[PDB]
């Protein structure tokens, strides 16, 4: 296990472009990463944007948010993709979360930004 609830991490999931999250407990399983049922490690993510949204992502696709520059590091991991316009808005705004959430100390970005779950 090398993440904990409320370390800053990329996540690079399916179509999107590595993403800024907070790795956080799962509201049903009460852990924040497993074994999944292919033998490998994930670990529980809520992306940063306007829109809550979470996932589990594979250890292989989670690496440490040292800041928003890393960004091209990741994408080198010339040919560039554009970048569209209604995505890299929505990518900027959850960015500009990351960024606050970078200096905060870890109790808090968990105070300030985990997901409060409704059944
Ligand atoms: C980056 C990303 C990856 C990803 O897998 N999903 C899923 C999560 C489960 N629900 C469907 C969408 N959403 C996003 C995302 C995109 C823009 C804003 C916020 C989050």
């Not at 907070?22 to 306007?50: C, W």
Request: hydrophobic letters at 35%; aromatic letters at 12%; proline letters at 5%.
């Amino acid at each position: 296990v090398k993440f904990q609830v409320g370390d800053l991490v990329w996540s690079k999931v399916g179509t999107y472009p590595w993403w800024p999250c907070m790795v956080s407990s799962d509201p049903q399983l009460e852990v924040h990463t497993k074994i999944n049922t292919r033998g490998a490690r994930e670990y529980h993510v809520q992306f940063f944007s306007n829109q809550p949204e979470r996932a589990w992502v594979h250890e292989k696709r989670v690496r440490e948010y040292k800041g928003h520059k890393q960004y091209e590091e990741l994408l080198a991991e010339k040919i560039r993709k554009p970048r569209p316009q209604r995505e890299r808005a929505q990518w900027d705004i959850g960015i500009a979360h990351a960024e606050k959430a970078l200096k905060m100390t870890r109790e808090e970005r968990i105070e300030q930004y985990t997901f409060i779950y409704i059944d």
